[PDB]
Design a protein around this ligand. Structure first.
Ligand SMILES: Cc1ncc(COP(=O)(O)O)c(CN[C@@](C)(CC(=O)O)C(=O)O)c1O
Ligand SMILES: Cc1ncc(COP(=O)(O)O)c(CN[C@@](C)(CC(=O)O)C(=O)O)c1O
Lengths: 401, 401
């Protein structure tokens, strides 16, 4: 017997594990529609133009690789706050916030759950939608809080169960924590309507719950960043002090560089100066300081007028294309002769489609066509190219026929 | 009352907090001898030549920014294992290890403490030397283990208390955890002698303790990487299955890029395949996947024959210079007319000197000369340039006179 003879084999990740499996397939026509990762119309990873140019200035500049403050690059930190909040914003104009650079959305989400475990003295309960992104569970559980659920999706009608959500939300105990997805709900692609949001805001404010916003797709829901931050701002402007996590993994295609941020909306500037210190105390014994590259890239872009403009034209370009892939898919399904209603494909927003396929179908998909998706029926439409939309339509159809 | 009205002001970091304070000083002659960060002889951050060239190949190559497996870049991962272990090594040749890319030394150290909290079923006790690097405490405490201490430094004689260490170590309960610094003990600069190491190995093996090695200075103790890994290898070759954390922050000057790795020495290749899965399950809900840049740089260097050679000439160059700064300092102290014995300055190895200065002296140093060090009397000699060795000697002397 050794030290680790009792450590058993744990399973591959529900999501990430798909990329691993995909990797090993020898089928020349394999498609990885597992993770939410953008591909150009050639079905090739796409590094944004503004990104290529921002990296080049960094180089040109001959910058050091010295340790960053515990909290991250100030410029990035500040530029994020702003991207989330809006320049007009009183919250931002008053400095009543604390933004800390995190290890992308995941890392921010975690710093945040660990902050909460430590200082949220009113409850240990975090409420997640049904369904929610898989990683939300272990992130919160590992940080040490309890998990709960509120109704969200209605698979019978392929949309938001608003009456059920309102009922569940209306009964969450006061001062509990609720996780809401800012826009492009994962894995559903169905977000509450503006009017619906106004209503949720009321009940959240009414029940005095702490709103935890996960903002991983700003600019992917509508192709417009300010429109994507509506709901978030609407909440804060209603007097709800939220906490939020931002990812630059998809909107900037900085996936493996890992750039993100965790923000806390406080009552005052002084309150923020104290939350800040405790966040740093939290981060220090975790990874000490954050990865500089991704943050340097982001910041140069966010803070360089022409990089910001180009960035926005590119975020528009990526959303339009997913749209053109959605369109083409449904169209192909009818063309293959599909008797099914594929309306949700084009109804849904974001990088995926929550297709409704059963596990046997997902299974057949992988094995007969070398098409990889998650077991919940979620496909990354973001990863389809003009060249294989036909192939997918066909397979989806065969296994559905 | 708000959400965070009860969150109090926590203090600035013992180490990192020094850089912050340093930042704000307007004294044109200020020196930051707080953190262990290398400066060239002009007292300027130094980005290694092999680094500048490896970054350039990355660019030239026009590589993607796609998500990395949960465990890191394989090449980096493997190249690390090797750097730690040696190519000859049976442990390495047998594949009885698991190396996971971490967020530098800190992040690896943490993934490791969280793994231990989760799977080390024999104790919750981690033994640290007296003194140890400040961050070791909160890293382990936050991960959830208990902290203990074993005697190490003897301030009366400015060296290792070998008889006291052996006594303390000889009584640590079986299957407990002990943290040992591979080389260039922080903040002491005094490492056990080869013969001393052989002896420690015996008692560790004898008491059946789990050896946790912190390898943040490989190549900084002697200017030779294989010599720096002696002790580590000696242990494993004695049959001790260690766990270790590596940082590329100093030896490669990748500070803010954050490249590191956590390794576990297992009994078999199959045991390693199972520890690996659990490590991934651990990492996933933490930061999901690691920062690619630093790892890409490291790997290209480690795995490119000519980059490895140049890298080694540069690691030699950095160690020699610290040595020349140590020499020059003591020399200057006598020249200023110091009545004190500064022998430890040149006796000590690594990036610092554990000077012995009292807090009032440290305080006067900062305020009258704008020279920043940690309160424990630790100065980063690595940060001295030919141009200010005189200034430091003089100040040290005034405040000591
Ligand atoms: C809702 C949501 N939040 C946070 C994250 C975290 O991403 P980051 O740590 O890379 O910033 C993701 C990632 N969703 C992806 C793209 C990736 C993943 O599973 O990690 C997905 O495939 O669902 C997400 O979908
Ligand atoms: C013994 C030891 N282990 C691990 C680390 C972690 O460094 P990394 O996370 O940057 O890889 C350091 C850093 N020691 C420094 C340089 C930096 C610090 O305090 O974080 C020091 O000034 O002591 C260290 O001294």
């Amino acid at each position: 017997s050794s030290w680790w003879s009792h450590v058993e084999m744990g399973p591959p990740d529900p999501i990430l594990g798909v990329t691993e499996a995909f990797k090993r397939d020898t089928n020349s026509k394999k498609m990885n529609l597992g993770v939410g990762a953008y591909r150009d119309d050639n079905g090739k990873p796409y590094v944004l133009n503004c990104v290529r140019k921002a990296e080049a200035m960094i180089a040109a500049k001959k910058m050091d690789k010295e340790y960053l403050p515990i909290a991250g690059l100030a410029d990035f930190t500040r530029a994020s706050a702003e991207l989330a909040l809006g320049e007009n914003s009183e919250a931002f104009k008053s400095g009543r916030y604390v933004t800390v650079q995190g290890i992308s959305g995941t890392g921010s989400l975690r710093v945040g759950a660990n902050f909460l475990q430590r200082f949220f003295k009113f409850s240990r309960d975090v409420y997640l939608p049904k369904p929610s992104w898989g990683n939300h569970t272990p992130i919160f559980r590992d940080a040490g809080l309890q998990l709960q659920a509120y109704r969200y999706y209605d698979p019978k009608t392929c949309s938001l169960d608003f009456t059920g959500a309102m009922e569940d939300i209306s009964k969450i105990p006061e001062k509990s924590i609720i996780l809401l997805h800012a826009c492009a709900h994962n894995p559903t692609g169905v977000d509450p309507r503006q009017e619906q949001w106004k209503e949720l805001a009321s009940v959240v404010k009414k029940r005095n719950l702490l709103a935890y916003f996960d903002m991983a797709y700003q600019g992917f829901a509508s192709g417009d960043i300010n429109r994507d931050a509506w709901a978030l701002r609407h909440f804060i402007e209603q007097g709800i002090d939220v906490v939020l996590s931002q990812s630059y993994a998809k909107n900037m295609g900085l996936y493996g560089e890992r750039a993100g941020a965790f923000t806390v909306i406080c009552r005052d500037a002084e309150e923020a100066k104290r939350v800040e210190s405790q966040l740093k105390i939290l981060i220090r014994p975790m990874y000490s300081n954050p990865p500089m590259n991704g943050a340097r890239i982001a910041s140069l872009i966010l803070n360089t007028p022409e990089l910001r403009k180009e960035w926005l034209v590119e975020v528009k370009g990526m959303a339009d294309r997913i749209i053109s892939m959605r369109t083409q898919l449904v169209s192909n399904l009818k063309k293959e002769g599909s008797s099914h209603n594929w309306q949700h494909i084009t109804d849904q927003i974001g990088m995926f489609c929550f297709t409704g396929l059963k596990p046997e179908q997902v299974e057949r998909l992988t094995k007969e066509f070398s098409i990889y998706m998650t077991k919940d029926g979620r496909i990354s439409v973001a990863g389809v190219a003009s060249s294989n939309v036909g192939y997918l339509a066909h397979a989806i159809h065969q296994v559905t026929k």
